[PDB]
Amino acid sequence: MNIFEMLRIDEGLRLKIYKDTEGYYTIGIGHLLTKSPSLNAAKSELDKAIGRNTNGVITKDEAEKLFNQDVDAAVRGILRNAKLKPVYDSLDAVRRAALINMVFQMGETGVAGFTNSLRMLQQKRWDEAACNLAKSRWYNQTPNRAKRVITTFRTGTWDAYKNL
Numbered sequence: 001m002n003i004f005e006m007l008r009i010d011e012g013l014r015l016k017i018y019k020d021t022e023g024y025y026t027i028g029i030g031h032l033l034t035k036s037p038s039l040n041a042a043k044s045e046l047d048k049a050i051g052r053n054t055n056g057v058i059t060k061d062e063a064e065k066l067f068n069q070d071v072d073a074a075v076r077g078i079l080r081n082a083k084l085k086p087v088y089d090s091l092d093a094v095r096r097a098a099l100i101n102m103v104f105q106m107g108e109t110g111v112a113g114f115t116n117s118l119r120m121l122q123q124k125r126w127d128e129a130a131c132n133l134a135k136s137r138w139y140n141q142t143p144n145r146a147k148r149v150i151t152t153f154r155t156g157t158w159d160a161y162k163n164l
């Protein structure tokens with residue numbers, strides 16, 4: 001198991017424009033196109049992201065290319081962020097994947113806002129971090145995914161993903 005397989009499970013794969021859990025236009029493996037209500041604005045972002053006239057449909061190769069770029073960007077965003085980098089540096093390889101997962105889903109700014117949870121993770125207080133992470137809109141809006149990510153932080157294993 002690794003970060004790519006992990007996010008593929010959490011995000012799924014769809015080759016036509018769709019609305020994510022928040023109702024935002026998205027495509028591929030959780031690639032957010034726009035927060036704008038307009039399907040035309042989304043198709044225009046998609047064409048720009050892909051580099052051709054897509055008409056809202058992409059191939060699997062194209063979805064996987066956006067995915068590679070998105071995972072890379074999330075990692076580089078953690079490493080350049082002053083609140084995230086020290087947490088990331090403190091963690092083992094499995095829990096690092098959990099942090100990347102959160103950043104991929106909510107962005108660098110959102111995760112940097114979990115000030116108290118980040119401090120507990122850095123201190124390696126795993127049960128206490130898990131309880132604090134669950135006191136969040138994130139957990140309340142997407143409970144099954146949040147539970148998988150939180151269990152990964154708690155245990156340092158891939159158990160929440162292995163029967164999937």
Ligand SMILES: *SCC1=CC(C)(C)N(O)C1(C)C
Pocket residue numbers: 130131132134
């Ligand atoms: S978040 C810690 C916690 C409190 C209580 C309601 C007693 N629980 O069942 C858990 C362990 C979730």
Ligand SMILES: [Cl-]
Pocket residue numbers: 010011012020026029030
């Ligand atoms: Cl998704």
Ligand SMILES: [Cl-]
Pocket residue numbers: 049
């Ligand atoms: Cl892009």
Ligand SMILES: [Cl-]
Pocket residue numbers: 141142143144145146
């Ligand atoms: Cl969920």
